[PDB]
């Protein structure tokens, strides 16, 4: 099964990006909170010229999955661990809040 597909029923405005790690993806994250969705992992910074920037990752986006690992319930150590270990093209499910 696609272990991440359910995310698009819980967050139907979420989207999938494919970002190649070349040295880095180009993001930082925090464990934070948003009024509309609660606590979780959010993009907190974005590196100029990076592949994440080129793929349309935005500061403030909620990070919902990394490849096949769901990050809806991940703590900071686990989410950053997933991002650091991933190689090649890294699939991220992101939700821009607006």
């Amino acid at each position: 099964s696609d272990e991440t597909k359910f995310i698009f029923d819980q967050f139907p405005k979420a989207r999938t990006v494919q970002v190649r790690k070349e040295g880095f993806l180009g993001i930082m994250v925090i464990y934070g909170k948003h009024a509309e969705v609660g606590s979780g992992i959010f993009i907190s910074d974005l590196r100029e010229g990076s592949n994440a920037e080129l793929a349309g990752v935005k500061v403030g986006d909620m990070l919902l999955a990394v490849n096949q690992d769901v990050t809806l319930e991940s703590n900071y150590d686990d989410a950053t661990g997933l991002l650091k270990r991933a190689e090649g093209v890294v699939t991220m499910i992101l939700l821009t809040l607006k």
Binding site: G23, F24, M28, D45, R47, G49, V59
Partner: peptide
């Protein structure tokens, strides 16, 4: 490879620690 330090879109500062 690309440098570990890069420009923050939030602060404009050159920082490391990129994922």
């Amino acid at each position: 490879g690309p440098g570990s330090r890069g420009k923050s879109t939030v602060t404009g500062r050159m920082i490391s620690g990129w994922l």
